[PDB]
Design a binder for this molecule. Sequence first.
Ligand code: HEM
Ligand code: ASD
Length: 452
Amino acid sequence: SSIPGPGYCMGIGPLISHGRFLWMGIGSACNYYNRVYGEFMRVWISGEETLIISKSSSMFHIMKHNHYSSRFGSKLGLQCIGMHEKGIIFNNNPELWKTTRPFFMKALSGPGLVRMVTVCAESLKTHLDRLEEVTNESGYVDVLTLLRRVMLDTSNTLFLRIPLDESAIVVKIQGYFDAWQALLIKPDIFFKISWLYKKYEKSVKDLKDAIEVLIAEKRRRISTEEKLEECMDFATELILAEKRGDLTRENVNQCILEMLIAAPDTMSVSLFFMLFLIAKHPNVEEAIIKEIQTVIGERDIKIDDIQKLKVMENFIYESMRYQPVVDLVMRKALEDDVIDGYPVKKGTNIILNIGRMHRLEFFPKPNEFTLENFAKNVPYRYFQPFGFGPRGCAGKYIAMVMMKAILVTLLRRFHVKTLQGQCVESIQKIHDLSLHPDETKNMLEMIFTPRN
Ligand code: HEM
Ligand SMILES: C[C@]12CCC(=O)C=C1CC[C@@H]1[C@@H]2CC[C@]2(C)C(=O)CC[C@@H]12
């Protein structure tokens, strides 16, 4: 089979599609092209031919095989944000990625995943006792900020544990994300005219500098620690690997940064959507509350509780399926292969449109929010909210633990109301690198009214 997609108009084809991506945003442009042309089609970002695919079969092939364990993006953009061959998220050097990923995998499972359930609860409790920090005169709670702050506090106390300015770092993380999202697929031309990006450059330096202060302190405490065996964590593991000859300092620093931003970026927006859904689906909210009473009562949340929270689990899955944040995955072909019917040359970029996939393929009622979509065991080859395989989400398991933990301890204590008519469907959204609320609009607040 040949490859569907717009015509290469002697070098105008590329310029339209790239422009379309820049104007529309990666996400929406992906949905546009899959709607016009097939569920498997071809576009250009910069020079490179880039496939946009929503086919579950293609999805599965790509995530399963080692020769797609790469992403893509502007080299200049990635260098600017410090992710060019440095972190893991957008580290596209196969060997450097291969040797960095293990550090993330260790910290995000085993004992750390067990600690996380209780660390999460405490962090949320502490902030729910400080609602004055985030609540309006008319009782409007800034949930986005609240969530980001606990997500950061959580990540810090688990992976780095150095005291920090919660509120400041949160704003800086938001700054970093904009830069990341802004520069990821800008053409090289863009980077020539400098009063066009120095904006983003300063956001990166803001966060990076702020984190250096923290890593610097972490280095001191380690160099004077008596029971070094007793108190291992993610940052320490990296620093020791660096003091063998295994890692670069630049690399260590980017890793710590990537580990700190991950949950604030994705978990908080995810939980936010989840909370709005709860507010608009009383039936579902009752099921959850009943399950909590049955399983937990008023005991503190514990690791052994999490498997038992079946209703919630399905709620989280359905929320993610219906209202994704991470609706698209960027990959690159490292070897030549034939995928379904189509030839895929090495160096070909790939965007997997998992959000659209979850609305076309397996589910009984794709275009409406129901736990019915999860009434029967769903094969992981038709539902990929995290990705799987050698480069699937590093936090895929701990994420489920965290989301359960915070959903439990929040709803346990508060009923959540939405302002006016507002629901996830009516929220104005940016659909670019991820799918999130446009925060230049308003009516994004909620009302937290007590229980009992
Ligand atoms: C609901 C929250 C989350 C969602 C929806 C999500 C989803 C995803 C997806 C779809 C990917 C791409 C995987 C692939 O290419 O197949 C990814 C990558 C990644 N995620 Fe998450 N994730 C979440 C939470 C987290 C958390 C809490 C962490 C750690 C604190 C994390 C760390 C990472 C890292 C480091 C990568 C890059 C992996 C690599 O390229 O090797 N994620 N995530
Ligand atoms: C999950 C994630 C990493 C942690 C973080 O801090 C924020 C995000 C959101 C964007 C994700 C990214 C991982 C790589 C993803 C899946 C892509 O290939 C395109 C969108 C992008």
